[PDB]
């Protein structure tokens, strides 16, 4: 019953001292948690033997040098259980002593109670909100086979330096969450050789038994995708584990899913087998009892004992040895491809080829009205022969989206090509289908995995469908870049449910998210010649992009762009100690008003200053001295223009201000009778200026 | 090729039918020429499957779409609207032929994609893939607890209360996260009423679906538990009756039907493409698909005359359906008098004397208790006297609080577990680890009958059901979403947990009412005002903490329902005396506000404390209420939130001061974290003299 699966099956190899590794694993969990008072033990237990044999055995990683360009590399999706990750790391030699375990989820201490990239030598994403790190490990999966396409694509499967694997540890909760569905569906179809994911399938989650919420038959899902799949019972079964794995790398054509049938908390007498396992600390007595079952002292904590570490330690030499080896094998890379190992260099480095930005789309103010979006399109399909690091695609929107770099093939198995699209191994467009969430995490994987720089695109409404791995993105202060077409109430007849409101806001709103919304054509060209040139740092990025066409405008300006606010013109006006009468604030597709109501306010004798505002996030993060030349604190009198809600720009417009804004939902009709019905018009802006007056 | 597109037609199927079908196709193809956007292709391929569906299949009455006992319908794929609004039309349910002509203008009954109030017989707004087939399920789950409330002793099909689920969903519904999470669910709860037709069709927006779609989607669906069938071609009709009867035969699983499909037959040149999907097809391909069918290529929106009549029988046939039903309703009425009087009670709206008299009261000074303790408290003493309320938890039952003690729980008796009975009739959801599902869900509950569903999870994931929030709130339904754990409150889980955005995010949803109760009595008050709908219709976040908080003094039920209310006036003051200050807080923060009003007494300064547990119904009150609280001439102004400082800059103005959170937390105890981050009274009382300063 609860016997049968607790029964070990030990290799060969398997000394009496790992036996002790494991045990310790165990303990050191159920003590850490005591120890603080609160977290989550009971996974950490029955997946010891587990971590311990991916870490010890299976992986290819030098604990000296988490950076190691070759490392296999490891992402605990179910975040959870953080002291699986962390033990490891402590008996592998990786950097956490024991001093840190026993620092479990106090302030500043290098073991929070989810993992935390960048807190952690070793960790190599942040987890905890679940799902994550799967849907990320596809992405890095991903950009793994097309960071060989760059360096290496002519060696032989198997053969480069640039070959290794990603190892995923998820739970049933990973399971439920609808990113995991969309990201698995995706793996199969790119067929993702390189991609091994443990599921913990224990019965269990906080509710207690999984009956009560999850029938499916979870491996026949992974069946009907196209993985690789495989049912191990029990999590003793180190055998069973070690063939599954072998299995799994003898496979290469598609990603493997290992289900691991097994009892939370094992060997809690009491404890296993139930939700209080999951996320509480045992209490003295389980604890004292548990230390017993083992052979433990249970009148000591944090025991480790000498031989245990001496041998986990091990690690550091094999390691070590390891990357000695793999080292001579790069070195003979770098001879034998000088070209490929310059571009490695440059983008390690994060420097760009002199004169990337040369080819840079220019128009003329006054040409031809063009929509923001076809511009980044112009835009990208310049900068692409010049960046091969440059890579994306969109959420079935390319058409809508203008994400296809013009003349670029597809990143996927040629048999996945179609009339349309052209998939090779090392391609370029990257078709995410209707899965925004996954496309999402798969972008943070992307970066996180290697030096590449990747976007995907979708509709600004539809953010709302992969919040959560945008936010995960700017907590772990990485590059992703979102790019959102459709911006507003100017996509027209696709209606309400279609049309973003709030959505400006409740992104800006994310802390180190840059919400980026270029005014016309050339903004749009200077908004991704920031971004690539990574001039405001490393922080995500939404480019915000019309469906519709606007206006090319006198008096925008890279450098003013890249300091997110600045004057489009000021009214002349003017005098030297010539404030303005009014600043008009505005950004994107409603600059245009700005402009125009500058010329009626004129016609009155009224001299407006209008500031175009492409990204706030980077305006605020300018000097005052920059700042208040550009909204000189004296003039009170100040108009915001977006259609958005008003939310966000209370700050800057003052007490005496207004706001130019949509607070309501809108309406299937054509853009022109939207704009002028919910009062998106010059003499609106003219008006409110005038009241911004009085 | 084809065979695909090859006819299928039972023995009752006149030539009539042929011209009903055929009608269909050019009317979609017209509809769209016409404003010249839009989705005609899907409208034409599913025309003979929604012609069935609605003329033959299913049980409703096209001169009342309010009857109770109306099997209900769902298009998942919103984009195909005219397939609803031609069916709509034909088949008498209140559209006309110009209501067709007018698709997608300002003010039409035919916008983009159907919404929810603004059509006769659109049972919900669809648009954002997955939602509607997620949905459907929550419709499927109302209709056998309703059955619970009205006629559970009834016999399997013998119930005026028994009628079918029927929902069409598209490639982009069955690759979105939310329909996997959805139909898991669907199965583990064995909704033998819920019939789901899925146009497998091989084609969206980027054309041919291989270049991201491989999976064996009915095989997936038969992991899940579910009924299974596929059928082929789109002219299939037999197929398709046949593969109706198997479904409704079968009572214990829900039921899944991929059907086959070429898009947008018969256009010679643009059917099996992306460009059938999403544009006007033009001109000539109009021409040639009336050619095709034998119908006038000159003349636009025509509509045979038999056509129509034969169609409109469906007026007839409804009536006498509603008739016989109506004498098994008044038979049962009789036989079921108590349940009568409820189901009375709840289509009018309206709550049993004395509901709210058991309501749990707290004496101001009492032991410190968490504002989700105090909500399971309520939940718990006013379930008893309210059965319409029932709802659950996305697997946190435990930490939101959301189990009525002694309750039961709602699924099959074969799910229960050890901590959870399952009835058929039970009241307790286990939504599992499917957040966005959750959210889909409650809209589908409220939408489908008059019982009142809440849905628990962490304020943090909100972010996973963000897009079914919004469009509970664009609906104007009145969806309940209990969020817990809502800000660095939360401790030790850390920064990937912690709320920092979410309530500025949520606040920016127009409609949405974000209710973040002071303490464990505003609330209780909080729920009566919530379960009164005192404030209107539309959708309900309650936000609640995980640690516990003072029981304050001043709580009011009738200034909760207010939204924000003087919670505190300063001790010096005079009748026409202004206090110096005012002190705006919401939630946790509430009692730094009236901690640091003692410290600023101490000084000789005059604070008022008001409590905004809704700022959106704050907001909606009069404004001789709102200069009540807030005077106007009283600049001197702090606000005090656990989260960012976006959302209360219009409150304070200019010259006041915002204690807020403007970055991520970290993984500590929570008295390190308010103390760290400046939530102490000390810091209250400094920003107020600041603003006194100013
Ligand atoms: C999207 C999301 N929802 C909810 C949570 C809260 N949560 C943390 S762990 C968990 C379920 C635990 O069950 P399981 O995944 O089986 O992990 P186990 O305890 O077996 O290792 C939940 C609901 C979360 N972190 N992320
Ligand atoms: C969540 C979401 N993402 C994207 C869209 C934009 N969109 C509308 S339909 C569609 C895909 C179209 O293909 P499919 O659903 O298979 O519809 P079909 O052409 O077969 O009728 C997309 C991406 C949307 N409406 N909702
Ligand atoms: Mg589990
Ligand atoms: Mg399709």
Redesign the pocket.
């Known amino acids: 019953e609860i016997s049968a699966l607790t029964r070990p099956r030990h290799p060969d190899y398997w000394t009496e001292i790992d036996s002790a590794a494991v045990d310790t694993i165990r303990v050191l969990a159920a003590d850490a948690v005591q120890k603080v008072g609160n977290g989550h033990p009971?996974?950490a237990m029955s997946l010891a033997p587990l971590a311990y044999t991916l870490f010890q055995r299976t992986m290819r990683h030098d604990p000296s040098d988490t950076h190691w360009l070759g490392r296999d590399r490891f992402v605990l999706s179910?975040g959870?259980?953080s002291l699986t990750l962390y033990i490891q790391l402590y008996l592998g030699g990786f950097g956490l002593e024991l001093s840190d375990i026993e620092s479990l989820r106090t302030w500043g201490s290098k073991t929070p109670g989810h993992p935390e990239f960048r807190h952690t030598p070793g960790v190599e994403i942040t987890t905890?909100?679940?799902?994550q790190g799967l849907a990320s490990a596809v992405g890095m999966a991903m950009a793994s086979r097309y960071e060989r396409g760059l360096f290496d694509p002519d060696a032989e499967p198997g053969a480069s330096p640039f070959d290794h694997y990603i190892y995923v540890i998820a739970?049933?909760?990973?399971i439920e969450?609808g990113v995991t569905s969309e990201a698995s569906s995706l793996a199969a179809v790119q067929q993702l050789g390189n991609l091994i994911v443990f599921y913990?399938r224990?019965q269990?989650?906080?509710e207690d038994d999984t009956n009560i919420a999850l029938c499916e038959d979870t491996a026949a899902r992974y069946r009907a995708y196209g993985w690789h799949v495989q049912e191990v019972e029990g999590g003793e079964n180190v055998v069973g584990i070690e063939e599954a794995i072998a299995n799994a790398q003898a496979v290469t054509d598609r990603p493997s899913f290992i289900a691991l049938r097994t009892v939370?908390g094992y060997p809690a007498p009491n404890l296993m087998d139930t939700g209080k396992a999951?996320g509480a600390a045992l209490g003295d007595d389980e604890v004292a009892a548990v230390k017993k079952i083992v052979g433990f002292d249970p009148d000591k904590t944090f025991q480790v004992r000498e031989d245990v570490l001496t041998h986990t330690r091990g690690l550091v030499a094999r390691g070590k040895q390891a990357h000695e080896r793999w080292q001579l094998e790069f070195d003979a890379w770098a001879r034998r491809e000088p070209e490929r190992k310059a571009l490695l260099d440059r983008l390690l480095a994060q420097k760009l080829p002199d004169g990337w930005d040369a080819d840079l789309p220019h128009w003329e103010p006054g040409s031809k009205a063009l929509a923001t979006r076809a511009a980044s399109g112009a835009v990208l399909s310049a900068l692409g022969p010049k960046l091969p690091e440059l890579w994306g695609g969109s959420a079935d929107l390319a058409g809508s989206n203008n994400t296809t770099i013009k003349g670029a093939d597809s990143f996927g198995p040629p048999s996945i090509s179609t009339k349309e699209y052209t998939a090779h191994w090392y391609g370029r467009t990257l078709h995410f289908g209707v899965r925004e969430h996954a496309m999402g995490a798969i972008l943070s994987g992307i970066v996180l995995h290697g030096p590449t720089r990747a976007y995907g695109g979708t509709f600004l409404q539809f953010s709302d469908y992969m919040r959560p791995a945008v936010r995960l993105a700017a907590l772990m202060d990485i590059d992703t870049i979102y790019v959102w077409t459709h911006d507003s109430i100017g996509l027209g007849e696709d209606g309400p449910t279609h049309q973003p409101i709030e959505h400006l806001s409740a992104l800006r709103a994310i802390p180190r998210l840059s919400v980026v919304r270029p005014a016309d054509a050339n903004e749009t060209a200077y908004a991704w010649r920031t971004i690539l040139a990574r001039r405001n740092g490393s922080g995500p990025v939404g480019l915000i992009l019309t469906r519709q066409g606007v206006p090319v405008l006198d008096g925008t300006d890279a450098e003013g762009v890249a300091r997110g606010g600045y004057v489009l013109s000021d009214a002349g006006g003017l005098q030297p100690g010539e404030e303005p009468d009014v600043i008009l604030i505005a950004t994107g597709s409603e600059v245009q008003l700005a402009v125009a109501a500058q010329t009626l306010l004129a016609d009155n004798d009224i001299l407006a200053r209008v500031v175009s505002m492409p990204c706030l996030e980077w305006f605020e993060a300018q000097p005052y001295e920059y700042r208040d030349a550009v909204l000189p604190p004296t003039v009170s009198a100040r108009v915001a223009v977006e259609a958005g809600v008003a939310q966000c720009w209370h700050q800057l417009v003052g007490d005496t201000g207004e706001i130019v804004s949509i607070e309501h939902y809108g309406e299937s009709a054509d853009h022109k009778t939207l704009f002028r019905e919910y009062g998106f018009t010059a003499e609106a802006v003219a008006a409110a200026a005038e009241r911004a007056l009085d």
Request: charged letters at 20%; hydrophobic letters at 25%.
């Open positions: 009971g996974t179910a959870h259980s905890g909100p679940l799902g739970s049933d909760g990973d969450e913990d224990n269990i989650s906080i939370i999951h």
